[PDB]
Every structure is written in C-alpha cells, then in structure tokens.
C-alpha cells in the first residue's frame, strides 16, 4: 500500500497507488467503477478489504 505497483486482483490488472477506501460494497461485488466506466476501487480477495 501507499506505493504504486503493477497490481492484479483475480485478473483485474492495473498500475497505481493502493490505499484504503471509505466506500462499502455489497457482499457479492468485487471492483468499483467511476462515472467514466473505468476502475477506481477493488476488494482484496483474501482480506475482503
């Protein structure tokens, strides 16, 4: 966290800084998208964070 890295989450790849979110997902959701249909949040698979 708090560094940018070539990340992957269940095959959701990207590059960016990872930091903790005030947003809550529903129990079944895995990643978040902005108004521009682009990814801006993701859940950790092992820590559900």
């Amino acid at each position: 966290k708090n560094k940018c890295v070539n990340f992957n989450f269940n095959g959701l790849t990207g590059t960016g800084v990872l930091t903790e979110s005030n947003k809550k997902f529903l129990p079944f959701q895995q990643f978040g998208r902005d108004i521009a249909d682009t990814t801006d949040a993701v859940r950790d698979p092992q820590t559900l964070e």
Binding site: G16, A36, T38, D40
Partner: peptide, 25 residues
Amino acid sequence: VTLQKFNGLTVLPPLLTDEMIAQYT
C-alpha cells in the same frame, strides 16, 4: 454555475486566477 487523471488527461489551471480576475473587474 456548477462543475480523470488516470487516463493521461490533464486539466491544468488558467494563467489568471479568479481572485486576479476579480481585481481587474
């Protein structure tokens, strides 16, 4: 009147600031 960086788009500020335009007006 009421009012993306992830995709290489940058929306850099104007030269004159709003408090400077306020001084000219």
